[PDB]
Structure 1
Amino acid sequence: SMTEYKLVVVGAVGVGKSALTIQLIQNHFVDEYDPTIEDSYRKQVVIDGETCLLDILDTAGQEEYSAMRDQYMRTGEGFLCVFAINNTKSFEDIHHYREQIKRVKDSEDVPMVLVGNKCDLPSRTVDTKQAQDLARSYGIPFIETSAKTRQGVDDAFYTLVREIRKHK
């Protein structure tokens, strides 16, 4: 049977966690905002010649439940850390999620990918260079995406699988 990868998508409310995941799984985008409680998805893919199963946990951004993330962080193998390039606050919130994952897993070596979503939008407030520098400071890849145009969507998830692969 094929290797399964437990991916978790995290980030502030409205950054595009669900829109990214539903583009991956269903190949469609809607501008409507349906706030997530918690959703799980499965998808078979081929990455660098190798077939595998993505088990994706799409989490809630709600800060009021920030104390209920520990179990899914323990269980997850890799994390897609999403902010929106037109929302400076979501970029600040990113540092918090990374520190929280590191603390909960008790490791400096957690597979993750920094994702700057909504790159189709003109109202950009977070510079490409800002995110590359943060990613570099973390030792993780940075990918620009648009759930709306599909730019970078596969690449973001597939890169995260590569990060998990190198860790194992």
Structure 2
Amino acid sequence: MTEYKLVVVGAVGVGKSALTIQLIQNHFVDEYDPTIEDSYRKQVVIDGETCLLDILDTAGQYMRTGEGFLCVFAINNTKSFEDIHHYREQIKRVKDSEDVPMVLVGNKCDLPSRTVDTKQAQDLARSYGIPFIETSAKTRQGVDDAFYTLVREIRKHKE
């Protein structure tokens, strides 16, 4: 059996669930309650491989066995983008590790209501190496690409 235990950290109103429930349940969640978090799961033919994404759409207020976290900001925000360090160092603090597999994705890139240029949304991601993508659950853009690229980051870390 092949599995992965993933987590989805971020602020409220960015799209943490919109990604979890567009990749898994397959439809744009018009709105999902940000004050609940179930440990969603789904099997997908990930990269020439058969893996089981036991995700966790966390909201604070598990995160030890977090194999790959999905630290996510909004491109039509900035408060959510400045919380990266406070969600970054959280993930390092618990795992007490400066090298934990992750991917900072830029969600809701479907809006022309956007401020966070891909520059900031790279130099920061380049400032931990870890990959960057630009999702939008209204479109299913890098939605799956965001989660899939986390798996590789998990595969790497071990070997």
TM-score range, shorter chain: over 0.9
State the SS of the aligned residue for 2:104: strand
Q: CA deviation at 1:135?
A: 0.6
Partners of 2:32 and 2:8 lie apart in 1 by 17
RMSD across aligned positions (CA): 1.5
Query: How many Å apart are 1:118 and its aligned residue?
Result: 0.5
Asked whether the 8 Å contact 2:6–2:70 carries over to 1, the reply is: yes
Cα deviations by residue, 1:108-128 (Å, 9 ceiling, x for unpaired): 110000010010011111110
Q: Does the alignment pair 1:73 with 2:72?
A: no
**Matched residue SS, 1:35:** coil
Deviation readout 1:1-22 (Å, 9 max, x if unpaired): x211000000011110111010
Cα pair 1:74 1:104 within 8 Å, conserved: yes
1:71-125, Cα deviation, whole Å (9 max, x unpaired): 9321211100111100000000111111111111111110000010010011111
* Structure with the higher strand share, 1 or 2: 1
Instruction: Give yes or no for contact 1:16–1:84 (8 Å, CA) kept in 2.
Output: yes
Whether the 8 Å contact between 1:43 and 1:55 is mirrored in structure 2 is yes
More helix by share: 1
Paired residues in the alignment total 158
Task: Decide whether the 8 Å contact of 1:36 with 1:59 is kept in 2.
Answer: no
Gaps of 5+ in 2: none
Cα deviation code 1:17-36 (max 9, x no counterpart):
11101001111013234223
8 Å Cα contact 2:64-2:94 kept in structure 1 = yes
Mapped to 2, the partners of 1:41 and 1:33 lie a distance apart of 14
1:159 aligned to 2:149?
yes
Going from structure 1 to structure 2, the CA distance change for 1:30 and 1:74 (only over 3 Å counts) comes to closer
Give the match's secondary structure for 2:112: coil
Any idea what the Cα deviations from partners look like across 1:115-165, whole Å, max 9, x if unmatched? Answer: 100100111111101011001111100010001111111100000011001
Local SS of the residue matching 2:144: helix
Deviations 1:42-73 (A, max 9, x none): 11112221111110011116xxxxxxxxx932
Within 2, Cα distance between the matches of 1:86 and 1:123?
6
CA contact (8 A) 1:5 1:55 kept: yes
SS for the counterpart of 2:38 is strand
**Structure 1: distance between partners of 2:122 and 2:8:** 19
Taking the aligned partners of 1:20 and 1:51, their CA distance within structure 2 comes to: 20
**Which SS does the other structure have where 1:72 is aligned?**
coil
Looking at structure 2, the residues matched to 135 and 84 of structure 1 have their Cα atoms a distance apart, in angstroms, of 14
- Indicate the residue corresponding to 1:116 in structure 2: 106
